[PDB]
Structure formats: C-alpha cells, structure tokens
Design a protein around this ligand. Structure first.
Ligand SMILES: C[C@H]1CCO[C@]2([C@@H](O)[C@@](C)(O)CO)NC(=O)[C@H]1NC2=O
Ligand SMILES: O=C(O)CCC(=O)C(=O)O
Ligand SMILES: [Cl-]
Ligand SMILES: [Fe+2]
Length: 280
C-alpha cells in the first residue's frame, strides 16, 4: 500500500542516513526521502508548477505555455502536452538564465548543487575511482552535466493515468511533490510514496543503473508512475543527465570493476529511446 522509505539529509560529510544498513537499503531500492534545507525557498517553483500551463492571462508564469520546442532548437524543451494526464514545461540549464524567470533559474541552480552533492555521495559508496567520476557521470560529478528543471501538471479532466510507469533517463532526480499520486514498484508491487512536503523524493535513473550494473552492489532505477488524478495535481523535478546537448554528447558508460568505463550508448539516444517506451 504505502512504501516505507529511508530518510536522509545532506550533512558535513555528504548524505547521512540513520545508519549504514539504511543507506544500503535506500540505494538498493533506488528511491528515498531527502530533507529539504530550511533555507531553500520552494514557493516560486511551487507557483510555477501551478501556473505554467495557463497562458499569458495568468501572472507571472502562465505565459510559458506559449514556448514550444521550436523556440529552443531542442525537441525535448518547452511546453509539452503528453498522452497521459500530464502536461509539462521542460528547460535545460543552458537556457535557464535567458528564458526562466530569475528566481526560477536561482532555484534550478540550488537544486543542481544539492543534486551534485547527492550524486558524489552515491559514486563514493559504489567504489568507482574518483578520477573516473567525471566521465562516468557525463559531467554531473562536477557541474558539467545536462540538467533539466521540469514542471508537471496533471489534468484531472483527462481520462488517462496520471503518468505511465517509467524509469527516469539520468543519474539523479530530485522530485518536489506535495500531494498524493506518486507510486513506486520496488518489488513487483505498486506502493504509494508517502507525502512529506518537508522532503524531496530522490530516485536514480537509467544511467545510474547502467553505470553500476556490473558492480558488486548494482543500483536500480526505480519504476514509478502517477495514478489517475481526480483533482488537479502539480509537482516539479530536477533531472541530472550525462551532457546531452544536440552538438555535444558525453555518452553513457558502464563501470567494469578493475578495468574502467565502457561506452554503452549516447545520452540523448538513451533519452529518446526511453521517452518512446514510456508513452507508446
Ligand atoms: C532528460 C529530461 C527529458 C526526458 O523526460 C523525463 C521524464 O522523466 C518525463 C516523465 O518527465 C518526461 O515526460 N523528464 C525530464 O525532465 C528529463 N528526464 C526524463 O526522464
Ligand atoms: O509528478 C510526479 O510526482 C512524478 C513526475 C515524474 O515522475 C517525472 O516527471 O518523471
Ligand atoms: Cl490543456
Ligand atoms: Fe519520473
């Protein structure tokens, strides 16, 4: 029914779970709760998620409904109506300063540095050598990855599932949710993720699963979905991927213990393949 997730916070040494066993469960499941720093203001992001889809009559964020992928030269970006209840606004970090409201780009930057700290804690626990982190993470072990700040709205009038079962593409997703609907399939049973507006939900994407698939303790990309919503719902997430610019793709790698990194596919290629199976 309801998943019982481990809870972590970022501290002086990195990710702090209650004990080492709890960290191992969290990383093995591929999903856990992360305490939101008390200084971090999420209210503008919350408002953007409630407004982005409403058009230019609605201030200050409704106008982002009018920015489609054409305006960015990148089919992933801008406003997208999906086949499920979900509609989205997606923007990669290279456009945040120019295109997002200033306070929304600020939020994106805070989340990038928090996620960077989360990812480095995970890479260390996997025993991957530090000098391989940059290439293994497509730049996300520093701040050279591809980062999408993505706003979600579930149109409860559409007779669809909220968002189909899927795995995220990348290494780390930091998910901000304040209402029921998110479900996870940790072990062949769907379970509700408990709502705690004081925590983010963190999960691993396909790139984390590929990277660690040959390690002693492989880490999984959690299968998750959003159930059919009878009232409206919104949320947003920060997604870290191997640099996947249209002209500069850092590739997707698997770590072979005692050997090094082996290339599996392209970063954008993984995203296109994954977006395909999610929706059709
Ligand atoms: C890379 C980018 C686009 C790909 O789509 C995802 C995907 O999780 C989803 C469900 O939001 C697309 O609808 N969203 C992102 O922001 C990012 N990662 C995803 O997996
Ligand atoms: O809205 C949610 O809670 C989840 C959204 C999600 O999983 C995604 O956008 O990839
Ligand atoms: Cl609509
Ligand atoms: Fe997701």
């Amino acid at each position: 029914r309801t998943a019982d997730l481990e809870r972590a916070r970022l501290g002086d040494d990195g990710l702090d779970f209650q004990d080492d066993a709890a960290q191992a469960r969290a990383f093995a499941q591929g999903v856990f709760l992360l305490e939101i720093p008390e200084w971090l203001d999420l209210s503008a992001g919350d408002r953007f998620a409630r407004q982005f889809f409403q058009g230019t009559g609605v201030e200050p964020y409704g106008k982002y409904r009018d920015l489609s992928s054409e305006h960015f030269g990148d089919e992933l970006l801008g406003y997208h109506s999906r086949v499920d209840q979900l509609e989205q606004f997606l923007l990669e970090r290279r456009f945040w300063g120019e295109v997002y409201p200033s306070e929304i780009a600020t939020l994106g930057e805070h989340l990038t540095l928090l996620s960077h700290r989360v990812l480095r804690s995970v890479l260390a626990s996997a025993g991957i050598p530090e000098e391989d982190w940059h290439r293994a993470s497509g730049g996300c072990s520093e701040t050279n990855g591809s980062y999408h700040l993505t706003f979600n709205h579930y149109r409860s009038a559409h007779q669809d599932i909220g968002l189909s079962s899927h795995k995220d593409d990348g290494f780390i997703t930091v998910l901000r949710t304040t209402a029921q609907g998110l479900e996870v399939n940790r072990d062949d049973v769907w379970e509700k993720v408990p709502v705690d507006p004081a925590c983010f939900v963190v999960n691993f994407g396909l790139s984390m699963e590929i990277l660690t698939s040959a390690c002693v303790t492989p880490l999984s990309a959690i299968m998750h979905r959003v159930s059919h919503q009878n009232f409206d719902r919104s949320s947003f997430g920060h997604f870290s991927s191997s640099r996947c610019l249209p002209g500069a793709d850092d590739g997707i790698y698997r770590y072979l213990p005692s050997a090094g990194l082996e290339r599996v596919c392209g970063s954008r290629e993984l995203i296109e393949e994954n977006d395909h199976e999610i929706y059709m």
